[PDB]
Amino acid sequence: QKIGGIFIVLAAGLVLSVLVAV
Amino acid sequence: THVREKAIDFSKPFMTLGVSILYRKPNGTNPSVFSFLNPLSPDIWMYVLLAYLGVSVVLFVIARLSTRIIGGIWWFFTLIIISSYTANLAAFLTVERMESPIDSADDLAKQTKIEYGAVKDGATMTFFKKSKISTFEKMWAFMSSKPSALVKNNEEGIQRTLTADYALLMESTTIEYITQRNCNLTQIGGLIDSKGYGIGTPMGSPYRDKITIAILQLQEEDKLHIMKEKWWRG
Amino acid sequence: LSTRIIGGIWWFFTLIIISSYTANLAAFLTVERMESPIDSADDLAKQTKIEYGAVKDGATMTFFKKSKISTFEKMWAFMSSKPSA
């Protein structure tokens, strides 16, 4: 769509993972 | 009229009646939430809540910075989405509101895409011939070119009004009559003209002058207005 | 979740409320004034919806009587076809 890349951008943001175990 | 004044004699008007416009009420309301989901397609109506679920699912999956950058990116692009659709929805409403009210009779003469036409052989066509206003003589040139909207009958123009975007153009008294008797059809705008109607007498009638004096007495006493009620509001 | 999801949904609902009224108030304060519009006298000759007229037996009546430009002689054929104006 017009805003379709933005709709991909919205759900791209979830897998961004940083240290937690230690 | 002066041609009819030269032809035959005339007493003072028994009614001064013009011509006015008639079109039906379109009669639209606005239906619920079904008219509220309108700028966007149903795909995206799924996609919004199917993206909105994911943030909650990864926040519950975290229970097993982080939240800082995550929450900043979520709010950060939620703002982009709502700014885009508030722009689209406000400009949707504003391009909606700019169309109305271009229904002018000055707006009729420029183009063919609205119907507007007299009762043919009435005094309306006579007045459009006799018209010296450029807009209404351009409407007269419109009606001469191709009739397009010209009806001949009252019921023909009523049916053209119900079946098209047709300004029925006829005398105001029959419009008052019909709009007392038919609430769908309504008079659009006001009068197109103000002209007097008289009683025909022979050329050289002193009966006409008696009739003039009696019209003065009648409309002084409003006996004709009883007749106006009983024949126009029924 | 009794404050988290529920407060999220109510915040979401008041977002709906404020975004809707934002679009409405934009579309209302835009459409309230959209016109400068008109500052000139030939525009009277163009329109047929608004009253306009010279004084009768004045130099304006004499001027439109003498007017030969089609728009102001249209004002004069207006004022001659209607001795209203």
Whether residue A11 and residue B44 make contact (CB cut-off 8 A), yes or no, is no
Q: Show Cβ contacts of residue B122 under 8 Å, excluding neighbours closer than 6 positions.
A: B170, B171
Contact residues, B window 99-128, toward C, CB-based 8 Å cutoff: 104-106
Task: Please count the CA atoms within 13 angstroms of the CA of B83 that sit on its side-chain side.
Answer: 7
Residue with tokens 């002689």: C73
C29 in reach of chain B (CB within 8 A): no
Report residue B198: phi and psi, to 5°: -120, 175
DSSP B167: E
Q: Show Cβ contacts of residue B54 under 8 Å, excluding neighbours closer than 6 positions.
A: A11, A14
How close A2 gets to chain B, by Cα (Å)? Answer: 10
C74 in reach of chain B (CB within 8 A): yes
Residue with tokens 């459409």: C31
Hey, which residues does B19 pair with through a beta bridge? B171
B171 is in an annotated binding site: yes
Instruction: Determine the Cα angle at B199 with ends B194 and B201, to 5°.
Output: 140
B2 in reach of chain C (CB within 8 A): no
CB B207 within 8 A of CB B7: no
B94 in reach of chain C (CB within 8 A): yes
Closest CA to B21 of B187, B224, B230: B187
Instruction: Determine the Cα angle at C85 with ends C56 and B196, to 5°.
Output: 110
Q: CA gyration radius for chain A?
A: 13
Hey, which residues does B30 pair with through a beta bridge? none
A5 in reach of chain B (CB within 8 A): no
Q: Which amino acid is at B64?
A: R
Q: Are strands B15-16 and B196-197 parallel, antiparallel or unpaired?
A: antiparallel
The helix (H) or strand (E) run that includes residue B196 is strand B196-197
Hey, which residues does B196 pair with through a beta bridge? B16
Give one DSSP letter per residue of B172-192, joined into a string.
Answer: HHHHHHHHHH-SSEEEEEEES
State the alpha helices, DSSP H only, in C1-85: 4-31, 42-46, 59-66, 70-81
- Whole-Å CA distances, B133 to B16, B107, B127, B161, B193: 21, 14, 11, 25, 12
What's the CA dihedral at B163, B167, B173, B175 to 10 degrees?
40
The helix (H) or strand (E) run that includes residue B213 is helix B207-221
Q: How far apart are CA B160 and CA B24, in angstroms?
A: 10
B73 in reach of chain A (CB within 8 A): yes
Whether residue A6 and residue B84 make contact (CB cut-off 8 A), yes or no, is yes
What's the CA dihedral at C28, C32, C34, C35 to 10 degrees?
180
**What does the H/E/C string look like for B15-66?**
EECCEEEEEECCCCCCCCHHHCCCCCCHHHHHHHHHHHHHHHHHHHHCCCCC
Whether residue B84 and residue A16 make contact (CB cut-off 8 A), yes or no, is no
Q: CA gyration radius for chain B?
A: 31
- Whole-Å CA distances, C72 to C12, C37, C42: 61, 20, 7
Q: Are strands B166-171 and B115-117 parallel, antiparallel or unpaired?
A: parallel
Kindly list the partner chains of chain B, i.e. chains with 3 or more CB atom pairs below 8 Å.
A, C
Q: How far apart are CA B224 and CA C39, in angstroms?
A: 46
Interface test with B, best of A2, A7, A18 (most B CBs within 10 A): A7
Q: What is the resolution of this structure in A?
A: 10.6
Q: Are strands B19-24 and B9-10 parallel, antiparallel or unpaired?
A: unpaired
